[PDB]
Design a protein around this ligand. Structure first.
Ligand SMILES: NC(=O)c1ccc[n+]([C@@H]2O[C@H](COP(=O)([O-])OP(=O)(O)OC[C@H]3O[C@@H](n4cnc5c(N)ncnc54)[C@H](OP(=O)(O)O)[C@@H]3O)[C@@H](O)[C@H]2O)c1
Ligand SMILES: NC(=O)c1ccc[n+]([C@@H]2O[C@H](COP(=O)([O-])OP(=O)(O)OC[C@H]3O[C@@H](n4cnc5c(N)ncnc54)[C@H](OP(=O)(O)O)[C@@H]3O)[C@@H](O)[C@H]2O)c1
Ligand SMILES: NC(=O)c1ccc[n+]([C@@H]2O[C@H](COP(=O)([O-])OP(=O)(O)OC[C@H]3O[C@@H](n4cnc5c(N)ncnc54)[C@H](OP(=O)(O)O)[C@@H]3O)[C@@H](O)[C@H]2O)c1
Ligand SMILES: NC(=O)c1ccc[n+]([C@@H]2O[C@H](COP(=O)([O-])OP(=O)(O)OC[C@H]3O[C@@H](n4cnc5c(N)ncnc54)[C@H](OP(=O)(O)O)[C@@H]3O)[C@@H](O)[C@H]2O)c1
Ligand SMILES: N#Cc1c(/C=C/c2ccccc2)[nH]c2nc(N)[nH]c(=O)c12
Ligand SMILES: N#Cc1c(/C=C/c2ccccc2)[nH]c2nc(N)[nH]c(=O)c12
Ligand SMILES: N#Cc1c(/C=C/c2ccccc2)[nH]c2nc(N)[nH]c(=O)c12
Ligand SMILES: N#Cc1c(/C=C/c2ccccc2)[nH]c2nc(N)[nH]c(=O)c12
Lengths: 251, 250, 249, 251
């Protein structure tokens, strides 16, 4: 039987590339999404057309709330209902926008940014672990290579990403006796935000030592694939920067 | 005119030691507390006896919720109401208990552990900045062992990691306002009251420098430094005060 | 044409496992060694039996000295002499022994521990770049450099310096398309001299399986970093430590 | 009796400000220097005028060589000769220049950059510990807040500074049982090279979040004074950045 993976926020961009690569590798996939229902369904169609009964969708808001634990449980459940197992969890979904220290209420900003980047990852990890040889079980968290040199006015985003480093390490330690590995992949600049003008995008590309360009989504997915694979069986609690040297560049 | 500081969770232990040291240095202090009302008022009385009208208490739950931003704004407002200014914020209040991955609902655990250790510090920092040779700074009580965490303390460690990111992000953002943001990271200092002496000694014996925990005063000493004029170019730094504990491998 | 790799300290243990996987992957290999001449030749013989004219040995002391730059130049030169190209450098050779602060002179300890773990990697990196596909360097680092073994200050200093080199060289060589990365074991193959009770003490501390990494598990990470699946990765150090570095005292 | 400190590279700039502040705090000082004999002798004269026979000079090249251990031992010996004790060691002396990967020979560049920034600190640390409740013994290493975002083409310098972090941590662990604390101070940009034009100085100044200015030498010395003080007696293995936030600033 083919192993199964949950990928959060998998309808577009890097999450989509991760789902596709895992599927190409032989995984059945749960495509979690929030608002991008058309893209999610279209991706499930494409993957199932390649191999029948290998992709489903699951919608959920991952904003922090009283009902988030239930939603996270239901996401993991959807993998078991469809495929009978859940071998890999990829925590990719993420809110990302500025939250100046000096639009939404601040409590909503907290809920969205800390929920998606940290609390949902923790609750999903709990549900994954509770629900569990030649098993190769693991979790991959999408972190941020620049968390120690953060973007101006993104404090809640950076707090969420830092908490996700903490979860990666804490869960690596705690889940190791069950054979569940927990690792991260830290992009620098990859797919720039769609809102961004090609001029502003070019300002970022020029800062990258390796090629003066952003990472493709596929290059990010390559690191996830490595971490879930049998070639990474002794690796837990590690975060692999995939940043073309960007984090090494001083101001 | 004496400057003024808010210390969160200041009724006892490390927060009291910080409040006391700041008061001894010349500061007027807001002693914030949650449940420890008797201890808070008792400390405030001791301090006012030493110097009249230099200490007030301020009660608030710092659990995460939709009114937490209001509560934090009110804590800052309380400093201005009592003292007409707010020079220093010390983010010390913290919930600390295990949350195993495999009593309280997980919703509550998230709200308390992430609220006290990260979200309240963030909201307090916002309110502090919004209300502003001054020497304005914020000091966050971090944790020296965040990269070598206690087993089954995921949410607490997430909250402390978030606090490091706040320290950094806020140091970057508030520098143009003259507001320095730094941290102090104990390893083992005052052990939990619920801990047995045998288990306390097991932790003590792990510390290279003296085989003992830091006194609360030792932690406060590092806070005093960071708020002082001796630290005027220091921002975004977290000073471990851990007697070498974090350097010791398994 | 097959690409070519230099692996330092490749006669035995982890460096051997790295040479072997690189060769299995398609590389021609320079098996650098210092004292383990028969092991080096035996490995070359095995690899050439598999594919003729694809392995050579190269002898060099990597202790710091005024001739170290010439020796490191000669190692890289030996790869071009055998294979006409040098695509991958793996800085694996390492001295490892205590140097307490309170047989060998301290001058010698410094030369050996800092030469092998830091200065030789620097000079090999210089010569690698000067002599220039998917070009990259991998440095064997140490997952425990922030929680070091007692009385191992010079070894730890060298391993810290090697993190600095990994970072500085990734930055400086990126415009040449040369990626520079690290792999950081926690406990992998335990020292030959170490007694079994002391080995078991270390094994019990590893969260993931309560065992040391095989040399092959360390090599797997090296293979990933030199591969086309790591083309945007530079300046990264991948811990391969079973969670050991996360364990508090 | 007053305590005594050795400060390496103390004739000018940051080392000088550190020596002066220690002396002001009540310490007797060994002013180590290499080439700056006029400056070192003048400083000791100024300090001795303030309090008799409270300063001595000691010249040594801290380049790595066969004689470096003896030299470092003699620096420490000079403090015991002068003052009968040695309570504080400040490893401040440092060579700093580019060594591009692609005219001093490279072996000389190694010897100077690695010798001054790491090997000499290690040998001084050995000699200091070998010579050793009322006592307050400590070492402070001058590190670099930018070691993870290094200057282009400064690999050997950056290697030396990283090795110094390693030493700081290793020596902290190992010397803790003797009551010797080992810490660092990590400037970002402080006194800029003396030749540097103001317009280049301004390029770095404009990057510093806290006041768009470099640190004074005195601001650096303030962190050293804290670390050797009785207010830091539980602090060991810590490196305090004194950088105005510069290291937090992305490319
Ligand atoms: N792109 C980069 O350069 C970069 C850099 C550093 C780190 N990273 C990290 O890498 C990962 C992928 O980045 P990316 O640019 O592909 O991400 P992204 O497009 O910004 O967001 C990925 C998905 O997150 C989901 N999402 C957002 N808010 C949500 C909520 N409240 N509930 C549930 N899902 C929500 C969205 O789903 P729907 O579209 O279905 O609504 C969105 O498609 C992220 O974790 C990110 O932080 C990316
Ligand atoms: N002790 C250590 O060894 C150690 C080690 C590492 C880090 N630290 C850090 O240093 C700081 C001080 O440590 P400590 O041991 O003195 O702390 P503590 O006694 O565990 O907590 C201090 C105060 O936090 C307040 N608090 C807890 N939950 C709260 C809530 N929901 N709302 C508002 N306030 C709440 C409590 O106030 P009331 O009593 O008034 O309810 C409590 O007195 C903490 O940030 C801690 O994480 C300590
Ligand atoms: N094993 C572990 O648990 C572990 C843990 C952390 C990091 N690492 C790192 O991983 C790498 C491989 O580890 P390992 O245990 O396989 O290494 P090792 O067996 O201790 O050393 C590998 C080789 O280094 C060479 N070497 C030593 N001194 C030399 C000198 N002066 N000049 C030239 N070559 C010299 C030796 O070659 P000859 O035999 O030919 O003389 C030796 O076979 C090392 O960089 C090590 O620091 C290993
Ligand atoms: N300035 C900054 O912004 C900055 C930034 C990051 C870190 N730091 C660190 O802070 C410390 C002080 O910086 P600084 O700018 O004041 O340093 P500096 O002026 O560049 O150098 C300090 C002294 O080092 C001594 N020195 C140089 N080469 C030597 C050798 N071969 N042997 C013995 N002594 C030697 C020199 O002594 P003589 O003059 O007597 O020859 C020099 O005066 C250094 O460790 C530095 O790396 C400084
Ligand atoms: N660009 C970019 C993003 C980044 C980049 C982070 C960064 C932080 C500091 C400096 C440079 C880049 N993080 C993202 N997260 C989500 N969910 N979506 C995104 O588009 C990005
Ligand atoms: N002991 C202890 C504490 C710690 C210790 C953290 C630790 C983590 C890993 C290894 C050792 C100590 N953090 C605390 N936070 C609060 N609010 N109160 C506490 O009593 C502690
Ligand atoms: N075990 C082990 C080794 C280690 C392990 C380092 C370590 C440091 C701190 C805590 C645990 C392991 N490094 C080695 N380097 C070389 N060249 N050879 C070795 O055998 C080892
Ligand atoms: N400026 C500067 C210096 C620096 C600055 C290092 C740096 C590295 C990366 C980014 C910014 C500054 N280090 C120095 N060391 C010595 N001995 N002397 C110096 O003048 C400096």
């Amino acid at each position: 039987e083919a192993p199964a993976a949950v990928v959060t926020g998998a309808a577009k961009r890097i999450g989509r590339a991760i789902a596709v690569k895992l599927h190409q590798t032989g995984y059945r996939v749960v495509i979690h999404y929030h608002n991008s229902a058309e893209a999610a369904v279209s991706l499930a169609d494409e993957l199932n057309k390649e191999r029948s009964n290998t992709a489903v969708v699951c919608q959920a808001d991952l904003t922090n709330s009283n009902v988030l634990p239930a939603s996270c449980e239901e996401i993991i459940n959807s993998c078991f209902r469809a495929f009978g197992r859940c071998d890999v969890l990829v925590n990719n979904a993420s809110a990302f926008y500025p939250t100046p220290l000096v639009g939404k209420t601040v409590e909503t900003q907290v809920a969205e940014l800390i929920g998606t980047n940290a609390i949902a990852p923790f609750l999903l990890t709990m549900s994954f672990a509770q629900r569990q040889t030649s098993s190769n079980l693991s979790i991959v968290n999408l972190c941020d290579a620049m968390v120690d040199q953060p973007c101006m006015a993104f404090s809640l985003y950076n707090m969420g990403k830092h908490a996700l480093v903490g979860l990666t390490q804490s869960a690596a330690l705690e889940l190791a006796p069950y054979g569940i590995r927990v690792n991260g992949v830290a992009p620098g600049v990859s797919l720039l935000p769609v809102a961004m003008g090609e001029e502003e995008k070019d300002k970022w590309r020029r800062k990258v030592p390796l090629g003066r360009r952003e990472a493709s989504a596929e290059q990010i997915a390559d690191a996830v694939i490595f971490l879930v694979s049998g070639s990474a069986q002794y690796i837990t609690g590690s975060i692999i920067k995939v940043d073309g040297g960007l984090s090494l560049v001083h101001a």
